[PDB]
A paper describes a structure:
[name]-1 reverse transcriptase (RT) copies the viral ~10-kilobase ssRNA genome to a dsDNA in a multistep process. For the DNA synthesis, RT binds an eighteen-base-pair stretch of a duplex substrate with the primer 3′-end nucleotide occupying the priming site (P site). A dNTP complementing the first template overhang binds the N site and the nucleotide part is catalytically incorporated by RT at the 3′-end of the primer with the release of pyrophosphate. Following each nucleotide incorporation, the DNA is translocated from N to P site to accommodate the next dNTP.
Fragment 048 is smaller in size and contains two rings—a cyclopropyl and a pyrazole. The cyclopropyl group is the only chemical moiety common to both fragments 048 and 166, and the cyclopropyl group occupies a common area of P-pocket in both structures, despite that two fragments fill different parts of the pocket. The cyclopropyl ring is positioned over the YMDD motif in the pocket, and like 166, fragment 048 binding knocks out the active site Mg2+ ion. The 4-bromopyrazole ring interacts with the residues Y115 and Q151 and points toward the dNTP-binding site (or N site). The 4-bromopyrazole moiety is stacked against Y115 sidechain and the bromine atom interacts with the Q151 sidechain. The pocket rearrangement is less extensive for accommodating 048 compared with 166, which indicates elasticity of this transient P-pocket. The deoxyribose ring of the primer 3′-end nucleotide and the YMDD motif each shifts by ~1.3 Å for binding 048 when compared with the apo structure. A superposition of 166- and 048-bound RT/DNA structures suggests the potential for P-pocket to accommodating different chemical moieties at different parts. There exist multiple opportunities to design compounds with pocket-specific interactions such as pseudo A:T or G:C base-pairing and extension to reach active site, primer grip, and key residues such as Y115 and M151 that are involved in dNTP binding; binding of fragment 048 indicates the potential for acquiring interactions with Y115 and M151.
Numbering used by the authors:
A (entry chain A): 0 to 554
B (entry chain B): 5 to 88, 95 to 428
Write the structure that this text describes.
DNA sequence: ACAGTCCCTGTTCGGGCGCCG
DNA sequence: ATCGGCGCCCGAACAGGGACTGT
């Protein structure tokens, strides 16, 4: 493949900077003879030119084995040059997903050979890619070269080749507007609805078209028969699946190992329904030691069994039909954990996924359901460019009473109710009017800002009072602690009057779970009660029982 | 025609905003628009060596089927240099009409040294293709500098019409031309068509509205009547009997309102709650307290004195979800010194889409700020960041985009709607 | 009115996964 | 050891802003 005739992209250094001047570090003897042998080859191939003392820049060079290949990959530690290269706007905005592929009669996956080594580099920038090959004998000075093509490891190479490949495909795509070509780096998914004979004719026109542009499509990387290995998937004519996932088996695990296990489990959740990682990610909390060994908790081990259980059965995905409606259904598995499947025909999932983010310290299931619907909505726009219809495990009246009573603007797109327990519910509901015949509790709490000690108590209309001393607390916690006392020392119906907007805004939001132990205790009391009315009054205004309890806790 | 030199503010780089996902409906509309803009030399293809980007998306035009390409030039406008009188009578006119004259900007070329900053990227479904990047070669719609650079040309086009109709107020803000008059609605719409055709001798306007008899839900933001905008007073309940809980809600409400109205007092009302009573206990208002309440009702009815608009300070607008499709808003520059307090209700849908509601209220509040002060406010939105961002582009129809931030408000602002 | 502490929310970066050179 | 660009997840440091409090 002679160097492509595409125009070089003008590349500059950051303003007021010079090129890299890094000396070459030692290399092993297997790599020294290979880099010299390799460098004269890729000078002969034209990718590299010799340079003289006029070039004052340098970058260390080494040579590692190519990824899953017998060929050697020539790599340069361009960490110093990358810091000085101008910034780019990456045109790769995401990764194509098979669930967005439509059905096609004929499919071809190509791969360009020596991709970066086919695209020329801007002439003005070539001086800064200078490097030196140190000889074996330290007495020899070493041979300096500069780069004429896109180096592997340079920060601009991926973006420029992606931009260059689109320019190379633009004329061919225009000469044949009905052939779909999914372009990611050098790998080309070509799909058409023509007959199988005429389709192979167009592939050769493309290979010849790319060959004219210095882009070889080697036969070793040319796939013509299903199954297709594309973007880490195994593509079949009517079904798609992920290339085999290998979960490691070890008797003792470390932090790094856990980090790998979480990652592979996330990668599997796109098609395997029911993957859970909350308890496995909890083991990654606090420890930044990558080689630290972590004992699996009782809850963590249970989580691994569930995932392995659903991984023994093969799962497949379906392709997308633009004529048929898009459907997504969500189920509540664990606390703060959700799994979903997007399909068109029931039990024929296009893809799956999971949402398990705890947004906020205080939340409920209805909030998380709206958060999971949004993650799916955005994800559906990326894959299919449209919003799916929803099937949610929440009652129609449950949502109607929530969004009408919530102070923030919340909305859910077109959705239908599915009776897949456990359902999402509001566990308690605060009264809109004070309860008649209910003991009125005027609660408050205080704390010193230096001492961190505080009080929390209440006074009632029935004359009942209480004050509890607390150690290692804050103002916000003691005021929350006072509301907890009134719920403890009251019947099933209680009126509570507080002066804390912070405690009021948390409770009024009807949370069912919280990172704070105290809030979970307050939530639990509200579910046990039958009617609760919570009122707020401005503090330090001589109002009702608020004034009596304020003096009780401030002393 | 030579381009006007444009600089960024000292020490600031160009915009670098990622492109957000778009529906196939919007991408296919955008691809057609940008391909046509490149043919007419209005935009041109660029590569990844341009490190700047500005988000782009599409909106359906007002009472029309055509699509309008919208650039999120908020970041570029914040970093663009400042250039170099607002008609106070425009808000007094009976009828005011908003004309999209952004199409006129596409005739003036842009300074080459500046074009790198107008870059945007069109995404592709399922990431089939890399983003195709374009930059602008002419003055772009939605750019802070476009109306300024075109300012000399706009006064020239309008001067004959403004002397032929001296009773018509014409204000310009970004792509929009605000035309206000006191004529009757029918003679006013003819005058708008008179301005459109007299303008047509120089620059084009959006395809004439497929309707002309104000089809409901369609001319909300088109044909505006400023003389019917109403302020939302703060109200207090009127009951024959007040309870301890009712007096506490009253005292808390009045104490908050004393920050907006100076004379609010709650002392004789707080005296009624001096015990440690039950919430449902009825408290008779003493003769002293009845007067204090009656005086607070009077204070909230009279307008606030000594609150004037400062053109150097930014405008801020806050919206509260009051329920039943009703939304309250306040526009101010300093805390508790409101420049206007309004209410919007019965917006779009039979009160189903909350987000559609909030989006319309934000547009109507901004329109009022442009008409009243010629500025746009910064919004404090009562919505989750992701809930808005996901859907707001689906209901936006203005040529400008105001700045906003997201807040989680405690439910103690019942001080604006009864 | 100024300057702190608490709490919450969001942004950025670190790890992992995956793709490609 | 010893690289580039993208997307995603999850965890944690830092900052911002608004409320309470103490001076």
């Amino acid at each position: 493949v002679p160097i492509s005739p595409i125009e070089t992209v003008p590349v500059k250094l950051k303003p007021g900077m010079d090129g890299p001047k890094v000396k070459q570090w030692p290399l092993t003897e297997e790599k020294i003879k290979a880099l010299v042998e390799i460098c004269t080859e890729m000078e002969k191939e034209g990718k590299i030119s010799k340079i003289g003392p006029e070039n004052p820049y340098n970058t260390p060079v080494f040579a590692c084995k190519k990824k899953d290949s017998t060929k050697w990959r020539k790599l340069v530690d361009f960490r110093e040059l990358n810091k000085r290269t101008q910034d780019f706007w990456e045109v790769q905005l995401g990764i194509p997903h098979p669930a967005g592929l439509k059905k096609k009669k004929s499919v071809t996956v190509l791969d360009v050979g020596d991709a970066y080594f086919s695209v020329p580099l801007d002439e003005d920038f070539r001086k800064y890619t200078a490097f030196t090959i140190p000889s074996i004998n330290n007495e020899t000075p070493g041979i300096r070269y500069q780069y004429n093509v896109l180096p592997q490891g340079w920060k601009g190479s991926p973006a420029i080749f992606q931009s260059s490949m689109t320019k190379i495909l633009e004329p061919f795509k225009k000469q044949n507007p009905d052939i779909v070509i999914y372009q990611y780096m050098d790998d080309l998914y070509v799909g058409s609805d023509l007959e199988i004979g005429q389709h192979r004719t167009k592939i050769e026109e493309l290979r010849q078209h790319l060959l004219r542009w210095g882009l070889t499509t080697p036969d070793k990387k040319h796939q013509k028969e299903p199954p297709f290995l594309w973007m880490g998937y195994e593509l079949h004519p009517d079904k798609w699946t992920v290339q085999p996932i290998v979960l490691p088996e070890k008797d003792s695990w470390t932090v790094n190992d856990i980090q790998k296990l979480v990652g592979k489990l996330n990668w599997a959740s796109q098609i395997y329904p029911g993957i859970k990682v909350r308890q496995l990610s909890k083991l990654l909390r606090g420890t930044k030691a990558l080689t630290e060994v972590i004992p699996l908790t009782e809850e963590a081990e249970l989580e691994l069994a569930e995932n392995r259980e659903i991984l023994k059965e093969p799962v497949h995905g379906v392709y997308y039909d633009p004529s048929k409606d898009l459907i997504a259904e969500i189920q509540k598995q664990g606390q703060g954990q959700w799994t979903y499947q997007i399909y068109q025909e029931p039990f024929k999932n296009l893809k799956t996924g999971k949402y398990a983010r705890m947004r906020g310290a205080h939340t409920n299931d209805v909030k998380q359901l709206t958060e999971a619907v949004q993650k799916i909505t955005t994800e559906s726009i990326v894959i299919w460019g449209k919003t799916p219809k929803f099937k949610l495990p929440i009652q129609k009246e449950t949502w109607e009473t929530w969004w009408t009573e919530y102070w923030q603007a919340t909305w859910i797109p077109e959705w239908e109710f599915v009776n897949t327990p456990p359902l999402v519910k509001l566990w308690y509901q605060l009264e809109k009017e004070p309860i008649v015949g209910a003991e009125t509790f005027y609660v408050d709490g205080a704390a010193n800002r230096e001492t961190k000690l505080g009080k929390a108590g209440y006074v009632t209309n029935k004359g009942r009072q209480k004050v509890v001393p607390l150690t290692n607390t804050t103002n916000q916690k003691t005021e929350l602690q006072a509301i907890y006392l009134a719920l403890q020392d009251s019947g099933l119906e209680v009126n509570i009057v507080t002066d804390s907007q912070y405690a009021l805004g948390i409770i009024q939001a009807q949370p069912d779970k919280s990172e704070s132990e105290l809030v979970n205790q307050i939530i639990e009391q509200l579910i046990k009660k039958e009617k609760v009315y919570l009122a707020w009054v401005p503090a330090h205004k001589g109002i009702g029982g608020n004034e009596q309890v304020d003096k009780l806790v401030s002393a | 025609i030579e381009t006007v030199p444009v600089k960024l503010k000292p020490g600031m780089d160009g915009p670098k905003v990622k492109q957000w996902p778009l529906t196939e409906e919007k991408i296919k509309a955008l691809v057609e628009i940008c391909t046509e803009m490149e043919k007419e030399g209005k935009i041109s293809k660029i590569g990844p060596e341009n490190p700047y980007n500005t988000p782009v998306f599409a909106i359906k035009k007002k009472d029309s089927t055509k699509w309008r390409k919208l650039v999120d030039f908020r970041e570029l406008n914040k970093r663009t240099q400042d250039f170099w009188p607002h008609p106070a009578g425009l808000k007094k006119k009976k009828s005011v009409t908003v004309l999209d004259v952004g199409d006129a900007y596409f005739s003036v070329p842009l300074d080459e040294d500046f074009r790198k900053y107008t870059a945007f990227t069109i995404p592709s479904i399922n990431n089939e293709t890399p983003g195709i990047r374009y930059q602008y070669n002419v003055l772009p719609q939605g750019w802070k500098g476009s109306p300024a650079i075109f300012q000399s040309s706009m006064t020239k086009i309008l001067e004959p019409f403004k002397k032929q109709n001296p009773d018509i107020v014409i204000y310009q803000y970004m792509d929009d031309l605000y035309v206000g008059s006191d004529l009757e609605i029918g003679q006013h719409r003819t005058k708008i068509e008179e301005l459109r055709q007299h303008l047509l001798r120089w620059g084009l306007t959006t395809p004439d509205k497929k309707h002309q008899k104000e089809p409901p839900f369609l001319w909300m933001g088109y044909e505006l009547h400023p003389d019917k905008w109403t302020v939302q007073p703060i109200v207090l309940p009127e009951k024959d009997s007040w309870t301890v809980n009712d007096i506490q809600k009253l005292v808390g409400k009045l104490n908050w309102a004393s920050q907006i109205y100076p004379g609010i007092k709650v002392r004789q009302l707080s005296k009624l709650l001096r015990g440690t009573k039950a919430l449902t206990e009825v408290i008779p208002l003493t003769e002293e307290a009845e007067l204090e309440l009656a005086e607070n009702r009077e204070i909230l009815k009279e307008p606030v004195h000594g609150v004037y608009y400062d053109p150097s300070k930014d405008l801020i607008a806050e919206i509260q979800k009051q329920g039943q499709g009703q939304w309250t808003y306040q526009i101010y520059q300093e805390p508790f010194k409101n420049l206007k307090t309004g209410k919007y209700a019965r917006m779009r849908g039979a009160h189903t889409n909350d987000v559609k509601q909030l989006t319309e209220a934000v547009q109507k509040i901004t329109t009022e700020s442009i008409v009243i002060w010629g500025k746009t406010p910064k919004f404090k939105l009562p919505i989750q960041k992701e809930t808005w961002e996901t859907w707001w582009t689906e209901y936006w129809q203005a040529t400008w985009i105001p700045e906003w931030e997201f807040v989680n408000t405690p439910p103690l602002v019942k001080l604006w709607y009864q």
